[PDB]
Enzyme design. Structure first.
Site, short mmCIF file in Angstrom:
data_model
loop_
_atom_site.label_atom_id
_atom_site.label_comp_id
_atom_site.label_asym_id
_atom_site.label_seq_id
_atom_site.Cartn_x
_atom_site.Cartn_y
_atom_site.Cartn_z
N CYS A 1 4.29 2.02 9.20
CA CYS A 1 4.09 0.80 8.44
C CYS A 1 5.40 0.34 7.81
O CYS A 1 6.28 1.14 7.50
CB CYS A 1 3.03 1.00 7.35
SG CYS A 1 1.42 1.58 7.94
N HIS B 1 0.81 -1.21 0.00
CA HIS B 1 0.00 0.00 0.00
C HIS B 1 0.85 1.27 0.00
O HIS B 1 0.28 2.36 0.10
CB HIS B 1 -1.01 0.00 1.17
CG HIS B 1 -0.42 0.32 2.51
ND1 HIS B 1 -0.41 -0.59 3.55
CD2 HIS B 1 0.14 1.45 3.00
CE1 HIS B 1 0.15 -0.03 4.61
NE2 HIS B 1 0.49 1.20 4.30
N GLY C 1 2.83 6.44 9.49
CA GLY C 1 4.16 6.33 8.93
C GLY C 1 5.02 5.24 9.52
O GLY C 1 6.19 5.10 9.11
#
EC number: 3.4.19.12
Lengths: 306, 306
Positions: B145, B41, B143
């Site tokens: 991830c 993603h 942020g």
């Protein structure tokens, strides 16, 4: 989202841990530039621990009696000296992995990360607080001495602690990196008195703010109180007294949550008087005191290090 | 002496974290050999997150649309492909700091260390468990991830987790390093059902053993019980059922403490039925389930890594 007891990343410290062996005793040392720092009781046997004369013991030792090794690298001691309770072993090779660092002496209630090591090799990392009685509740086994505590400020490692002893009560005592013990303890295997372990009130408040930020709000009342009325109740439950400096340090948290410090104090007092009822706060049934206001700001903001 | 929620040392993982930027989205990647692993993603905007067609989105992207940087080092993407929910960005430079590693898929109840990162830079490390409903209770901000979970076995890093999503309930979901989610979750910003979060019974028992080892013994009775009678009570309190495999895994702890597993089960049942009374165990007012039997053996023995 979420809240965890977070340690600093340990990479910059892992590359400074060495093994120090003098005679039959082996423990951990901290290798920065061309000097190795370690607890001076590396020169004791288990028998000498009950009444050591460190001057007398050290003088029957020469440079070649100390074996320092970093992994499978053998270092050569070319100079030694005793500074308070740490031995400074001057070696020939500067550590290529020496980070930007400083030595600092912390105050009770401050937090730091401990890298627990055995025979110069890292085993694990955890976060803890200097208790108000100058002990720490750590996890240390035989041979972990010389393990160090640290903070990471900016790109600089702040070394603040070195483990020396386990006391008969099971708690841990150590020094700063200049060899001065935290607290009234000495590097001697004898019955030593630790004082009352009180709760770090300012840290509890910072954690309550962290809970509100994360959605745990059931403990909030619109009650208020003053510093004196709160401190009367806090002193009854063995809580450290709150001062105006503490209120100031909670300022940024007050601003981001819209909740006044004295209002949060009134919520805490009711929790002290009436208990948790069986509810929890951020997954805990007890009031947590090992987060400073700075830890909370750090974690709820996303501060990174390099 | 003492017991702490201990993380693995993070040094060997710190040197593998990079920053991945595609368009306006920036998150963390894992750089091993000449490939960067990151959540797919990264190719979505915040708007595309509610119903992404990852095939369609990925095809309007070329090698030069992905900017990977390790510190102030700019890497060059020469090949990309999608494996389940992770993007494999083939780069030109192999990571000189690639440790011995393997990818593993863990089972619920197992523990691992998470290195929480932002923009490719480490922020902190903590220890957690894969819950039985395949979530983790972590600490993640926007942020984070692509932050990874790992174990250190011997001298080898076992990568087992990569963070992808925060669910509306505040818990965290992620994949293994092959891109397969843990649990029934998908990388889509939508209402997703997490099941019942039960307590990992075998872990609670390992922690009770750790308490006995460390001197906390007030909960011990000479009562006994059987597996079936215990499981009847455990199921009432949303505890995972204990099997014979679990009894076997507690074997080494039973041997070192002289306390039978079924005897420890009888103590736990009374704690479930009558509560903690307000006492604590190893400084905790709740039953702790984020230590495996192996963590306990590791910590109470002094296992080191290299």
């Amino acid at each position: 989202s979420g809240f965890r007891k977070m340690a600093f990343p340990s990479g910059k410290v892992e590359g400074c841990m060495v093994q120090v062996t003098c005679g039959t005793t082996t423990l951990n040392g901290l290798w920065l530039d061309d000097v190795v720092y370690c607890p001076r009781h590396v020169i004791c046997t288990s028998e000498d621990m009950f009444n050591p004369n460190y001057e007398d013991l050290l003088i029957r030792k020469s440079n070649h009696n100390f074996l320092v090794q970093a992994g499978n690298v053998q270092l050569r001691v070319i100079g030694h000296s005793m500074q308070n309770c740490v031995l400074k072993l001057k070696v020939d090779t500067a550590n290529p992995k020496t980070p930007k660092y400083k030595f600092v002496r912390i105050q009770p209630g401050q937090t730091f990360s401990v890298l627990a090591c055995y025979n110069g090799s890292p085993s694990g990392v955890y976060q803890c607080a200097m208790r108000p009685n100058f002990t720490i509740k750590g996890s240390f086994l035989n041979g972990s001495c010389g393990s160090v505590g640290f903070n990471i400020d900016y790109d600089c490692v702040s070394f603040c602690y070195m483990h020396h002893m386990v006391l008969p009560t099971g708690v841990h005592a150590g020094t700063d990196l200049e060899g001065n013990f935290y607290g009234p303890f000495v590097d001697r295997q004898t019955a030593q008195a630790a004082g009352t372990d009180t709760t770090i009130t300012v840290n509890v408040l910072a954690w309550l703010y962290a809970a509100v930020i994360n959605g745990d709000r059931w403990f909030l009342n619109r009650f208020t109180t003053t510093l004196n009325d709160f401190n009367l109740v806090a002193m009854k439950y063995n809580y450290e007294p709150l001062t105006q400096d503490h209120v100031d340090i909670l300022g940024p948290l007050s601003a981001q949550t819209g909740i006044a410090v004295l209002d949060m104090c009134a919520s805490l007092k009711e929790l002290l008087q009436n208990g948790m009822n069986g509810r929890t706060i951020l997954g805990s049934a007890l009031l947590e005191d090992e987060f400073t206001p700075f830890d909370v700001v750090r974690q709820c903001s996303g501060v990174t290090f390099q």
